[PDB]
C-alpha cells in the first residue's frame, strides 16, 4: 500500500454536485507527493459558474496523500486500502445553513489515483453565505480528528471547517466522516494537520480553483 506513494503520483478528481435544484460538474487534475504531504491541483467547473463557493467544496474534492512520519506509518489507513481503494462518506452541516452529503471512491486506475464523488446539498438558504456567495476565497488550517471504526473495518473522522466571510464573521461547517475499504490497518486516535492555499490561473477563462495543500499526521 505505502509502496505506491513513494514519489509523485498523478491525480484525477471528479465531482457530481446537486444543490437546491442546481447541478454542477467539477474536474480536477494534478499531483500528490505523500513523502512531503503536498497536493498540487487545478479544478475546473465544466458546467459554468458554480452555484456554491469553491471553498465549500475543498474538503470534498485524497487524504491518502497526508504525510505520515515514520513513527506513525502503522496508523495510515488511507494507504494500504490501496490499490483497491476506500469509500469516503461525509455529512457536512453548515451552521445556520444547509447540509452537504457526499460519497466518494478513492482508488488507483493505472498510475493515477482517482477520486470520484457525488454531492447532494439540501436546505440551503437563498441569500445565505453559501448560495449568496459571501465566503472569502481562502482556507484555514484544521485538525482532522481520526478514530478507528473496527466494526466497519475502517475509520471515522470529525472536524469543523472555518470559512471566513466577507462580513468579517465566520461560517462553521461540522464534518462527520466515514471511510471503509473497497477490497478485502486500523489506527489509534490521531489527527491530521492541514494547510491550504486557494488561487487562480490568470489565463483561465472558465470558473476554476487552483489549490496547494500540505497535510501531515500527528498526535502520538
Q: Which of 122, 79, 88, 77 is nearest to 13 (CA)?
A: 88
- Residue 25 or 137 having the CB closest to its own copies: 25
Euclidean distance between CA atoms 213 and 200, whole angstroms: 14
- Residue 104 or 215 having the CB closest to Cu ion: 104
Q: Which three cell numbers stand for residue 134?
A: 459571501
In whole angstroms, how far apart are CA 95 and each of 120, 135, 164, 173, 214? 17, 14, 13, 6, 26
**Which residue among 35, 46, 138, 160 contacts its own copies (CB under 8 A)?**
46
Number of residues near its own copies (by CB under 8 A): 9
**Which residue among 4, 8, 30, 47 contacts its own copies (CB under 8 A)?**
47
Q: Which stretch binds its own copies (CB under 8 A): 13-21, 101-109, 128-136, 171-179?
A: 13-21
- Residue 22 or 156 having the CB closest to its own copies: 22
Rule CB under 8 A: which of 16-35 touch its own copies?
A: 16, 18, 21-25
- State the nearest-atom distance from the C-beta of 98 to its own copies, in Å: 16
Q: Among its own copies, Cu ion, none, what does residue 24 contact (CB within 5–8 Å per kind)?
A: its own copies
- Residue 68 or 124 having the CB closest to Cu ion: 124
- The answer to whether 190 and 219 have CB atoms below 8 angstroms apart is yes
Q: Among its own copies, Cu ion, none, what does residue 185 contact (CB within 5–8 Å per kind)?
A: none
- The answer to whether 9 and 32 have CB atoms below 8 angstroms apart is yes
- State the nearest-atom distance from the C-beta of 116 to its own copies, in Å: 11
Rule CB under 8 A: which of 113-152 touch its own copies?
A: none
In whole angstroms, how far apart are CA 18 and each of 25, 46, 98? 9, 14, 13
- Under rule CB under 8 A, residue 84 binds its own copies: no
- Residue 50 or 217 having the CB closest to Cu ion: 50
- State the nearest-atom distance from the C-beta of 18 to Cu ion, in Å: 5
Phi, then psi, of 104 in degrees rounded to 5: -150, 150
Q: Which three cell numbers stand for residue 145?
A: 480528528
DSSP assignments along 101-168, one per residue: EEEEEEEEETTEEEEEEEEEEESPPTTSTTTTT-B-S----EEEEEEEEGGGTEEEEEEEEEEEBTTS
Rule CB under 5 A: which of 1-30 touch Cu ion?
A: 16
How many of the other CB atoms lie within 10 Å of CB of 66?
A: 25
The site for Cu ion (CB under 5 A) is made up of 16
The site for its own copies (CB under 8 A) is made up of 16, 18, 21-25, 46-47
Amino acid at each position: 500500500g505505502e509502496e505506491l506513494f513513494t514519489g509523485v503520483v498523478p491525480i484525477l478528481i471528479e465531482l457530481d454536485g446537486h444543490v437546491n435544484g442546481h447541478c454542477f460538474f467539477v474536474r480536477g487534475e494534478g499531483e500528490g507527493d505523500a513523502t512531503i504531504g503536498k497536493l498540487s491541483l487545478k479544478f475546473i467547473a465544466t458546467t459554468g459558474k458554480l452555484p456554491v463557493p469553491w471553498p465549500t467544496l475543498v474538503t470534498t474534492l485524497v487524504q491518502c496523500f497526508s504525510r505520515y512520519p515514520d513513527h506513525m506509518k502503522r496508523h495510515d489507513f488511507f494507504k494500504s486500502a490501496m490499490p483497491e481503494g476506500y469509500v469516503q462518506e461525509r455529512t457536512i452541516y453548515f451552521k445556520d445553513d444547509g447540509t452537504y452529503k457526499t460519497r466518494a471512491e478513492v482508488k488507483f486506475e493505472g498510475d493515477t489515483l482517482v477520486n470520484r464523488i457525488e454531492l447532494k446539498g439540501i436546505d440551503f438558504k437563498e441569500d445565505g453565505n453559501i448560495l449568496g456567495h459571501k465566503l472569502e476565497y481562502n482556507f484555514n488550517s484544521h485538525k482532522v480528528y481520526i478514530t478507528a471504526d473496527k466494526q466497519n473495518n475502517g475509520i471515522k473522522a470529525n472536524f469543523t471547517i472555518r470559512h471566513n466571510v466577507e462580513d468579517g464573521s465566520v461560517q462553521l461547517a461540522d464534518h462527520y466522516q466515514q471511510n471503509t475499504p473497497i477490497g478485502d490497518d486500523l489506527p489509534d486516535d490521531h489527527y491530521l494537520s492541514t494547510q491550504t492555499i486557494l488561487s487562480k490561473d490568470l489565463n483561465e477563462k472558465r470558473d476554476h480553483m487552483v489549490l496547494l495543500e500540505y497535510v501531515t499526521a500527528a498526535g502520538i
